[PDB]
């Protein structure tokens, strides 16, 4: 339950478990997903953090975590390396 910070993307902490394998290769995809998600979840509804896991094959899991009063907006999403249209899945 201890997380390391991959990057802060416009106020959103992108985190992964401390000993999770490297995810640097997924950063451009993660940045696009966060960028698109942050377009629609603004103000007090902006996510506080996103937990990234998996990614050793062609699939990555992203868990967007909001403040407690906006936790009905929390989502787990699955993205592909090859399959595109991050704009549809991350909005």
Confirm if 12 and 32 have CB atoms less than 8 A apart.
no
Cα within 13 Å of Cα(81), Cβ side:
11
Which among 89, 30, 28 has a CA at the least distance from the CA of 60?
30
Around Cβ 61, how many Cβ atoms within 10 Å?
A: 13
Measured CA to CA, the distance from residue 16 to residue 88 in angstroms comes to: 23
Whole-angstrom CA distances from 8 to 32, 45, 82, 88 are 13, 17, 24, 23
Residue ranges with strand state E in 1-91 = 3-9, 12-17, 49-54, 59-65, 75-80
Which among 75, 47, 72, 71 has a CA at the least distance from the CA of 62?
75
């Amino acid at each position: 339950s201890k997380f390391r910070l991959l990057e802060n993307v416009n106020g959103v902490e992108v985190l992964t478990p401390l000993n999770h394998p490297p995810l640097q290769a997924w950063m451009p995809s993660i940045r696009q997903c966060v960028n698109k998600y942050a377009e629609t979840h603004t103000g007090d509804s902006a996510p506080v953090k996103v937990i990234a896991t998996g990614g050793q094959g062609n699939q990555l899991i992203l868990n967007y975590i909001h403040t407690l009063p906006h936790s009905n907006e929390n989502v787990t999403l699955r993205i592909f390396s090859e399959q595109n249209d991050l704009g549809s899945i991350c909005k």
